[PDB]
Symmetry: C2
Amino acid sequence: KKDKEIIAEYDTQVKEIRAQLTEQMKCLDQQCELRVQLLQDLQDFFRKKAEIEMDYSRNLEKLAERFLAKTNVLSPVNCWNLLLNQVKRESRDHTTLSDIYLNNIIPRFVQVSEDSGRLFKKSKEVGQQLQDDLMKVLNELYSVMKTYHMYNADSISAQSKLKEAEKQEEKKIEKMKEKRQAKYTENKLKAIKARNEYLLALEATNASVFKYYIHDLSDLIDQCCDLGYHASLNRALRTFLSAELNLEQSKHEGLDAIENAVENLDATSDKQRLMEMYNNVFCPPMKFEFQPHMGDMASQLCAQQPVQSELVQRCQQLQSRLSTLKIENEEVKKTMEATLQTIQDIVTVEDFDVSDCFQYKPSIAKRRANQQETEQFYFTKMKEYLEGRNLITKLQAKHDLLQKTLGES
Amino acid sequence: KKDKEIIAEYDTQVKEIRAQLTEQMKCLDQQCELRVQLLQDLQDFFRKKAEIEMDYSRNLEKLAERFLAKTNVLSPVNCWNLLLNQVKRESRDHTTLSDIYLNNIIPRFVQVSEDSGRLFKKSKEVGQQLQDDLMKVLNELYSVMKTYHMYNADSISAQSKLKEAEKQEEKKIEKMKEKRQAKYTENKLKAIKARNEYLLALEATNASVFKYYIHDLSDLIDQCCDLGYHASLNRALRTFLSAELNLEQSKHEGLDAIENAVENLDATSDKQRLMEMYNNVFCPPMKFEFQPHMGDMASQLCAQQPVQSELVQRCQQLQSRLSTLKIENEEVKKTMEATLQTIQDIVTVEDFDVSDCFQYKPSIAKRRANQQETEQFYFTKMKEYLEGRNLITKLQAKHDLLQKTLGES
């Protein structure tokens, strides 16, 4: 192994390290461009997202305000009222969601976009200070082995001259060559010293490289994230999460109001509220009272003989005639209640769950026609029931007045 | 009470009823216009709402697709990935919400808008049939009291002639006036009969009016809602509720994915994934090995006398020198860990809850400046800690090789 063979071998190893170290800082420059790219991507994203949220908010207020530019309340009207109210509420929530995007979310990105710029520059500062400190230890070794090569070559240079002086000799020739041992032991002691120093120099340099690549490099990676790159983004994103979570609770609150307006839709309530509004239209008029002629003294049914027996005849005959009419007016009403239930069981169907629509028949024309045959029949049963009702009223009214005057004797 | 005084009194009462009955059907025509107005309002509403939902869906796909037209993954990148994924998901949910509005919700309104038209026409059919049936009973009474007025006037006409025949009398004059009692009792029996009939006619008419205004009117109100006006709207609205409830579960599912990407943001994970990607850039190079000169046989520290005592001297002195350096390199690191914690406690703040923004300071400039004084100091402590680290490495490496060769004797 020649004097230059060793120096060229280390110099090739080191030229690689200088190439590696410079490519390590180029690697950090990529990751800084990446950091500021993502933050810019986030900025422009929420800049357009806020634009779109406010655009959505605008259209919903336009819809709600158009149907309120036309503006006792019934249950279906109240459902409609809470439908327009929700739309006006949801729009207000979206203006605020857009404000959070611009005044809260984005100002974090502009701050961290400057922080990622500034802290990288300060990290690279330590980075270059560490690279230079290592490069010191590397080029230190250059002069230490050059010392070793020189001292070891001189130790063998005295060793060859000693074996030639022993070849010739073994008057003053034996006494003269005595200084060859005095200079060989000198050169060997020195070559031992330079070997020692170089051996400790290697052990120093080997651990120096070790602690850079393993510790200093790793420590510097987490350094520009410690600082708190994750910690600052945790907040930025949770600000967005809380914003969308508060929109979720606000939409849900209004939706349960519509849902409750659907619950406490009542037919009996709409019947009463309509007649309370028009108390004069559905006003029951004054009963037709008995008007005597010329000042007629009698006011009740004069059941005097011989009309008593005629009234006895009619009353006992009306009693079985009203019984027969009622018997067959109901077992009409019973069919009319069956038909009503039939139409009711068609309309009381649970075809509202559209859960199938979010997951990733020709007989309909006959069912609809079938509904308009049952309704047609329902009315023809009602016309039949009410027409029969009219006569039972005029027959019962005559019968009950007959019973009070007399009875059945 | 005169013959015409009675007839005019009833005729005024009835002219009011004909006015009332006609105003009852005019009242139903208002409520039908109202029913078809609300259904039309609902139609146009969802027609514009679906237009707006699809418009919103379009812009979100445009946003998501722009940032995916530019398209191992790190934890902040993965957060960004799930942010764009959610926006692409939410947009798809809004296309479907718009389809429900047009293909499911609206076709119910067009059906019920025809049903409210048709069933009203059939209700008014029964309505007019009931009005006419009542008007029968009313104008029935006209001829019954005209019968009573005639029969009661003739009963008193025979009564006056009887008291004049008793005045004159009390050959054949007493026998001739006997037929006056034969015609008075005749006319009284008939006037009793006509009174009876009219009294029963009143009782019939009074109950007939009763059952119209109380029962027939009420029964006919619920009739055009029984049919199932509430029952058809219950479904129509619950179709909308299920649609907005399924959007709510779908948004929430995607939001928890972003939230989980925030949870399992890790510094240690980003450190390892970055070095796995660039295994050649952060590549630990080959250790600098001992290179002998000319073929030097020795390879270790030649601790031969008289260098043994010199190594004993240096090792025992390095042992207290490395101890002193470490003592004051840490109690630097301890301040460097305090400063790091100081900056960490600034960035680990819970300022994300924006619940205050949905409910219906000048010291910020000093806090931000304060953060950039602590960071400045942190780096100056790190430069101080790492510079001190470098020397402890080169001193320990020389010391530990010294100890293995010998020890401390």
